């Protein structure tokens, strides 16, 4: 489908077209300012992914466990009976905590790898 | 044994110059082109960091200067341009029976002036201050501006009250605050702290005496680029403020006329009472004590067996020979000679002031400004927070000097430095890439 | 001044479990990697397990990879080892030792610098 | 700690907060020009890391040996008795050489991997 | 050699200096607009590589087979007897197809890796 | 050949009275109007 | 000799020489310049 065609699709189906939305983020002083701001926001999202250990990835698995209090729904209800727009609302109050946990777990992983490589 | 390891995010920096942005919470210095401030700005103390500061090479001063010039010109541009005032004026004394100061200072000048229609002229009577009117040779006079520049009339709706402005670093840069008590102005600081933005700085314009600035915390601090070189100015930051009460006691009125299809001119009207001299009061004991503190600290750079003498200014026009300030929107010029006449060997002081409407700010030639008169009696209270002194045998004579507005901002920006972050470096570690 | 004090268990039977613990003093606990070395009553020394200074990387000798868990608490200055199954061949003195690893920014070790006196574990 | 809080910390302690400084690099023609220049410099640093084989990493180990002449200090003096500000000065005259060596070793690694993958 | 020095070199020789050209992509309203556009195009190329699974790489191997119809030349003629300027012309009509195939194969690889990691 | 992608099962809330597009369109029209009239004859001599 | 189209007489021909020709140009008269004020900050310069 096309840009945002999956907006009404379930999460487990909508994830099939992540590339379609990813490619549409980069594609008269006010307009130049808007373009510079769009570039800065793109780079902020790429930096945020980079500091989590997710570089050239659209789907990236991490080692942060789900704490249940964020959302205690069954896995099949989240992926088969929900859209991404609804999910973005259910956990809108927990994204800062998750982001902090991801940053800390990446710092621990990078330090452990640096030490592991030293074993001659 | 050891291998190169690359680190990104390294907390190091280099000296750099860049463009800082305005942040501030009509008014000439409070335009919409300024970012709202952070209600809770951060400050991070840097332990065991001793950075070297140099207030005399600080690029933030030139940017602040240019930004103020830009805001000033932008505010005055969309206003009435009074080219029709370069006409012959026929002037007599306003108050021929006055036996006090202001005798001959206010002149009642008649001129024609244009009207809404190009085919008709009117007859206008208005009062001008002596300082704005020069004789041609009831006498014929012209405005001083007709010698060098047309005047743009300031819009009466735009206030000249100072509003604090915060300067903020762009992403990738940081501002380091000295926080070193009794800071020399140059050299290492032991209490360097990183801030997102500077404190609010009021764009207060004055000569000879710095007003509404920051005070020293421990003692009077005397700073200069070079003390030995007599061509440099000395900025003295006081640890206490001196209260200044300035006034224009006359109950002045304002009249206005139309001068064209959408333009109007405002002018000095009658006086609803006696004509009185504008003036300003300073406490005598407080000033004498403050000057004593200044000499006590000043002797440290010259010797304890010297004589420090103060004297008034010498040459120049009222922009540099007198103290000047914006009080209530009116522009005052004050003599000050009563403040700097003393020899220091090992209840109220009243200074006369003149009002001038034709203004040539920023030491520019060719861009004159006309200040509209303000109706009513003007009174304001200011704080002296610092002095400007210049040097001129065991006796050293000091004079107010001043006149270069950047010297009025270094006294506030002396504690900030701009650095660039370069978060990339290498170091040896026992770590090989397989 | 460096001391490691074992506070272990006694006799268990095969199929059970036993937890050993060591207390450290005289040095910064979090600055050194620590390990366990086993010595059967009539045999020589062998390495059993190694834990790094942060308690994030653990290594085991093949014979115990599926049986022993090594952990540390840097706030308590406590090292502990949870041993399962405990067969007859595991009777030995278990010594705590400081050394055996260095976290990349420290100089090389690859040796056991300090030793405790040893807990006696029997089956 | 906060932004640059580790500036006076030792290298072996200061490295614990690399993320804190990394996140503060992205966070009226003169101001727009300053923003564009900041973006270009950020991208130049990311490209420089990319050509060394260090993409989504804050700590990255390489195969370039230390030549000692750059700095002959003991490893424990550099990491425990120095700050990053001092270290940046001790080797300020050698960073171009190290960068060139890193670029060459990455070119060799990429070519060797390309050939190694061809062994059916 | 210097910037574009390899333009007349064969493909198998020209590939030795990819870093030299890569480093020259980042190194008055009209000029500011040109700089912003150059940044956007750089980011579009980096995003395009990222969605193919080629992040911090100058040479990146993929799992898309060559279909021969795109070019049926012997491997040694392409790499030893051609320049990159000529090659860019021979297959100028097929690059959109190849790019689509690369995007699809990366989507399949990322989904398969996500499922493979779930095997406890 | 501009594109339109129908969004199935999407029910977004609209508010035409708080739509920021109106203020931009207004300002853009004012700007174009003033730019077009600026480089033209200024008839100050008619105030006769 | 270069041109967009030699046959088309509407195009210009640019001839680039391989040697330079030296040109000595002069205004021999010892001309003076006078000036007057014309307004509040303006002055006009004229042939004297
Ligand atoms: C140093 O700081 C002091 C303040 O700490 C400053 O003195 C203050 O100046 C302002 C502006 O001149 C004074 O504010 C005025 O107060 C009078 C009171 O009668 C008002 O009538 C004035 O009204 C104006 O603003 C109104 C805004 O609503 C308008 O409606 C009106 O038409 C006028 O335009 C104005 O509010 C303030 O009172 C003094 N403070 C004191 C204690 O006197 C001083 O000027 C600063 N130094 C320098 C050099 O500027
Ligand atoms: C919308 O709802 C229908 C009916 O439940 C469903 O078949 C379809 O997959 C949903 N999503 C889209 C994008 O149409
Ligand atoms: C889950 O979140 C709550 C707070 O919302 C916290 O108290 C709890 O410790 C968290 N659980 C885990 C395992 O981190
Ligand atoms: C104003 O213009 C009239 C024109 O007749 C002239 O007579 C008069 O003197 C002018 N006023 C002044 C003050 O010059
Ligand atoms: C007029 O300007 C000149 C310089 O341009 C100055 O010398 C002269 O004094 C000015 N006139 C008066 C009356 O001040
Ligand atoms: C620097 O900071 C310390 C700690 O706050 C303080 O004791 C010291 O006096 C400061 N230095 C100066 C010169 O103020
Ligand atoms: C200001 O400094 C002087 C020393 O020059 C000192 O005697 C005085 O007490 C100080 N005032 C304050 C308020 O600290
Ligand atoms: C600051 O201290 C230094 C001492 O190194 C001195 O040379 C310099 O003149 C001082 N600055 C002032 C303004 O006194
Ligand atoms: C300060 O001025 C004096 C003037 O004679 C000069 O000799 C001295 O070198 C100046 N200081 C510096 C640091 O240049
Ligand atoms: C000035 O005169 C006006 C006349 O209406 C009066 O209202 C006002 O109060 C007077 N102000 C003073 C300070 O005398
Ligand atoms: C100026 O003098 C004239 C003389 O008739 C007088 O009418 C006028 O009121 C005077 N100006 C003022 C402001 O009083
Ligand atoms: C200035 O005015 C204040 C009250 O506003 C008064 O307390 C102070 O003594 C005055 N100072 C002088 C020098 O008049
Ligand atoms: C007041 O001024 C005199 C000089 O006229 C001076 O001797 C005296 O010390 C001054 N008072 C103070 C407190 O400084
Ligand atoms: C200040 O007043 C004195 C008289 O007390 C006078 O000699 C001096 O010239 C005046 N200064 C100025 C700048 O008007
Ligand atoms: C002037 O100084 C007094 C302290 O004597 C202070 O309370 C007041 O706020 C100061 N005024 C300004 C405008 O800073
Ligand atoms: C600063 O020095 C003290 C004393 O040596 C030390 O404990 C501290 O870790 C150092 N670093 C910082 C950031 O305070
Ligand atoms: C170390 O650097 C020197 C030049 O500073 C060079 O001559 C020497 O060969 C280098 N050593 C190695 C192993 O590359
Ligand atoms: C150019 O042609 C010559 C002769 O065939 C060949 O040796 C050379 O490698 C080619 N490429 C370059 C860059 O000179
Ligand atoms: C090769 O391309 C042709 C179209 O140009 C297509 O029909 C054919 O199926 C392709 N071969 C493969 C193996 O995909
Ligand atoms: C350049 O050469 C071509 C031959 O292909 C010729 O057709 C063309 O006219 C020439 N250009 C000029 C300006 O003579
Ligand atoms: C050059 O001009 C002639 C004019 O008749 C025209 O016929 C010819 O086609 C032109 N050349 C080209 C390449 O169009
Ligand atoms: C032109 O006349 C002036 C008159 O002062 C003289 O100085 C100058 O030399 C003359 N120049 C020539 C070329 O005659
Ligand atoms: C133009 O003619 C007048 C006639 O009186 C003469 O005075 C003047 O000098 C002439 N102009 C010049 C430049 O000589």
Residue numbers in the entry:
A (entry chain I), D (entry chain B), E (entry chain G): 520 to 546, 572 to 664
B (entry chain A): 33 to 57, 66 to 141, 150 to 185, 188 to 309, 312 to 323, 323A, 324 to 397, 412 to 457, ...
C (entry chain C): 1 to 52, 52A, 53 to 82, 82A, 82B, 82C, 83 to 100, 100A, ...
F (entry chain F): 80 to 127
G (entry chain E): 272 to 309, 312 to 321
Please give the exact wording used by the authors of the publication that reports this structure.
N332-GT5 was designed to induce diverse human BG18-class type I precursors.
We employed cryo-electron microscopy (cryo-EM) to determine whether N332-GT5-induced BG18 type I BCRs engaged the N332-GT5 trimer with a BG18-like binding mode as predicted by the sequence analysis. The third Fab, RM_N332_32, had a BG18 type I HCDR3 sequence but used a kappa chain V gene, VK1, the most common kappa chain V-gene family among RM-derived BG18 type I antibodies. Structural analysis confirmed that all three Fabs had a binding mode similar to that of the BG18 inferred germline (BG18_GL0), with the HCDR3 engaging the base of V3 and the LC straddling the V1 loop. Overall, we conclude that all three BG18 type I Fabs interacted with N332-GT5 using a BG18-like binding mode, which supports our sequence-based definition of a BG18 type I antibody. The approach angles and relative heavy chain-light chain twist of all seven N332-GT5-reactive Fabs clustered around BG18 and its inferred germline, whereas the other N332-dependent bnAbs approached the epitope with a wide range of angles as has been described previously.
